[PDB]
Amino acid sequence: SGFRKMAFPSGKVEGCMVQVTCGTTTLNGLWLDDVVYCPRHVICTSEDMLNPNYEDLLIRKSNHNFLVQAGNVQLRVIGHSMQNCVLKLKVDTANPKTPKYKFVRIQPGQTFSVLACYNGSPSGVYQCAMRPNFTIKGSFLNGSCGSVGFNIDYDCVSFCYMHHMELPTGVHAGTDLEGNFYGPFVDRQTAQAAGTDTTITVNVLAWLYAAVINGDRWFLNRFTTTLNDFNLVAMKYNYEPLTQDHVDILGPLSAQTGIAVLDMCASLKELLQNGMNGRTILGSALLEDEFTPFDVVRQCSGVT
Amino acid sequence: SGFRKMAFPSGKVEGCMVQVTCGTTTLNGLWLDDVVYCPRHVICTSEDMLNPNYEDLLIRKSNHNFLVQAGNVQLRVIGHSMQNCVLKLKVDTANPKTPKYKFVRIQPGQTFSVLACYNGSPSGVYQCAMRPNFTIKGSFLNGSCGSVGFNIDYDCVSFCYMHHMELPTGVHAGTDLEGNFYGPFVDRQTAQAAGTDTTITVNVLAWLYAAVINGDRWFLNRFTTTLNDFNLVAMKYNYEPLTQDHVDILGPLSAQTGIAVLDMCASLKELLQNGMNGRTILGSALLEDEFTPFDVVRQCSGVT
Ligand SMILES: Cc1ccncc1NC(=O)C[C@H](c1ccsc1)N1CCC(O)CC1
Numbered sequence: 162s163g164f165r166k167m168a169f170p171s172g173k174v175e176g177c178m179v180q181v182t183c184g185t186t187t188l189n190g191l192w193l194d195d196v197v198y199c200p201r202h203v204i205c206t207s208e209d210m211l212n213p214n215y216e217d218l219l220i221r222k223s224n225h226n227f228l229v230q231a232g233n234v235q236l237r238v239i240g241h242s243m244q245n246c247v248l249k250l251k252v253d254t255a256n257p258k259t260p261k262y263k264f265v266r267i268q269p270g271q272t273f274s275v276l277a278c279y280n281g282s283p284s285g286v287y288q289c290a291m292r293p294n295f296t297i298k299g300s301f302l303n304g305s306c307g308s309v310g311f312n313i314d315y316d317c318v319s320f321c322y323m324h325h326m327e328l329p330t331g332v333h334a335g336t337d338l339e340g341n342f343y344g345p346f347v348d349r350q351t352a353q354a355a356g357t358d359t360t361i362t363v364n365v366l367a368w369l370y371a372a373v374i375n376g377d378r379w380f381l382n383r384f385t386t387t388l389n390d391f392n393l394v395a396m397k398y399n400y401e402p403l404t405q406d407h408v409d410i411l412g413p414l415s416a417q418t419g420i421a422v423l424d425m426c427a428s429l430k431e432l433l434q435n436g437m438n439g440r441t442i443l444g445s446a447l448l449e450d451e452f453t454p455f456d457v458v459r460q461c462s463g464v465t
Numbered sequence: 466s467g468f469r470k471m472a473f474p475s476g477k478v479e480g481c482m483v484q485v486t487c488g489t490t491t492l493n494g495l496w497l498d499d500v501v502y503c504p505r506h507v508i509c510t511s512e513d514m515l516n517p518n519y520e521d522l523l524i525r526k527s528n529h530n531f532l533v534q535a536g537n538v539q540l541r542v543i544g545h546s547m548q549n550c551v552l553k554l555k556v557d558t559a560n561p562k563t564p565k566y567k568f569v570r571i572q573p574g575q576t577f578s579v580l581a582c583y584n585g586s587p588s589g590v591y592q593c594a595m596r597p598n599f600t601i602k603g604s605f606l607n608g609s610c611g612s613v614g615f616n617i618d619y620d621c622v623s624f625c626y627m628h629h630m631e632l633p634t635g636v637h638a639g640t641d642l643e644g645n646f647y648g649p650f651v652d653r654q655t656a657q658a659a660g661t662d663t664t665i666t667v668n669v670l671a672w673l674y675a676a677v678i679n680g681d682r683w684f685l686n687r688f689t690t691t692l693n694d695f696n697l698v699a700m701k702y703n704y705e706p707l708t709q710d711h712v713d714i715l716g717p718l719s720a721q722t723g724i725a726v727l728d729m730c731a732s733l734k735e736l737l738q739n740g741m742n743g744r745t746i747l748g749s750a751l752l753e754d755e756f757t758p759f760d761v762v763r764q765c766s767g768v769t
């Protein structure tokens with residue numbers, strides 16, 4: 162009973178967080194095996210944040226300029242390299258707390274947990290989604306760079322995000338663990354506007370199925386629709402188009418509740434057209450889109 | 466930038482979770498030092514869940530009947546006792562991962578993180594609040610009993626909740642770590658209706674200050690009010706009365722934003738009277754009450 166925005170347990174990731182300092186800038190690093198991953202903007206000065214040439218700035222840096230501290234103990238840096246927008250600091254000690262891990266590049270719509278950190282210390286954990294405009298609506302202050310996003314599959318942590326930038330509109334941009342930014346964002350203090358923040362339709366449907374499983378059923382109507390009819394409505398409301406792939410992924414939720422996907426689309430269509438009329442669904446007065454069909458199944462079944 | 470429902474990092478608590486089995490019932494235990502804490506209803510049979518006499522049922526149990534497993538290794542039970550609605554299983558080994566800890570009994574309005582567990586394994590972490598009717602709106606399935614609620618102050622975990630029951634209305638009831646239920650709830654399969662779920666006014670105000678700090682300012686009006694006038698409005702909308710103690714606790718947020726507490730009360734008064742008019746605040750279409758003034762300060766300052 163109940164449905165909450167739930168994050169993965171953060172323990173496995175807390176054991177990886179370290180502090181990285183270069184000159185006067187301190188941010189967070191991710192220590193996995195004998196490598197510490199951190200945003201390359203740790204090497205940047207204030208007078209050159211507008212147009213930094215990272216290859217040129219990195220030439221002035223040596224192994225001893227990267228100060229890596231794990232808890233209150235210093236790690237010895239024996240190598241450093243730049244991979245896209247991340248630095249990889251080879252240390253002389255493998256992290257004894259290295260969990261089983263993978264690096265994955267997620268697609269928009271996919272959710273993940275963020276372990277927000279400052280000075281290599283965790284402050285909190287929250288659930289996020291890669292928005293369709295490749296931003297994330299996080300909670301990050303100065304010093305949070307290098308904090309990571311991840312998913313967990315039993316004992317394996319799939320790292321998907323590393324925090325790099327705050328856009329002038331208070332939304333967030335970052336990279337996968339290969340240093341490639343999600344979206345068109347660049348690690349420089351320049352005008353970077355985000356595109357349309359559309360709603361993740363498949364996630365809203367999954368959340369409506371979670372609502373039905375938990376007893377919130379007022380929004381269920383006597384209607385049905387087609388993928389094409391639904392998508393005309395979705396386009397009007399800045400919702401992502403629904404594909405047959407999305408219909409297939411919602412299959413288990415459709416099977417559990419006995420509500421066909423296209424019937425749930427018709428319910429969503431009426432909620433978009435009429436609003437909630439001051440009513441709520443799973444304690445929300447808006448349509449939640451940061452639960453994937455996988456998250457709903459996981460939470461509703463109790464996967465550990 | 467940004468404001469999220471954030472949980473404490475769960476690592477310190479994950480290292481305490483164990484599985485406790487008595488007969489055919491398996492639930493979660495909290496292993497701190499050489500004691501495992503778990504709900505006493507682990508000893509109950511199905512044919513006696515209506516009116517169990519726990520003292521009498523416990524007489525038929527011995528140390529060897531409580532199976533405690535930490536990871537995949539079995540703990541040896543050398544003593545057992547009942548303290549209110551929790552059992553304390555003395556084991557022969559101190560938990561090597563025991564964090565610094567305290568047991569606290571929280572008041573309604575206070576928030577905490579829950580590490581939901583099944584079979585002694587963590588499934589997720591989410592943020593909760595002790596409702597004014599002493600229930601919690603959690604996300605718990607069968608097998609989640611013994612999962613705990615907690616707050617963290619740097620290196621010290623203050624355990625405040627242990628999950629025991631699901632009420633017929635899908636809300637949750639449990640105890641502090643001394644085994645005393647929050648509210649009037651009892652650990653038996655009987656009719657237990659919850660009282661009025663009123664809104665935690667001081668928390669809503671704190672969240673409105675967080676909204677102002679993060680740029681959502683449309684709701685700020687040209688008005689002010691008094692504690693007495695505000696409280697008449699709060700009573701009408703099933704909001705908890707605001708006291709001078711609450712005004713004092715909001716002081717730091719008032720000082721940071723330059724918005725007097727009574728002016729923020731007047732803004733809240735107009736939001737209650739007029740609604741949001743299809744607008745949102747910190748991505749919510751309703752007034753959020755599960756952030757305390759302390760949580761807002763913590764998140765907005767970056768405490769680790
Ligand atoms: C400030 C912040 C808040 C929340 N999340 C992230 C950040 N950091 C940034 O956006 C990085 C950026 C940068 C550094 C090197 S090249 C570009 N940033 C440094 C801080 C500075 O005040 C203004 C530029």
Ligand SMILES: Cc1ccncc1NC(=O)C[C@H](c1ccsc1)N1CCC(O)CC1
Pocket residue numbers: 162506509514605606607608609610629630631632652653654
């Ligand atoms: C089922 C559940 C879901 C979410 N959170 C908690 C629970 N468990 C309970 O409410 C405990 C209760 C009990 C056991 C011993 S005396 C009373 N409960 C066992 C399960 C049973 O089906 C019906 C009674």
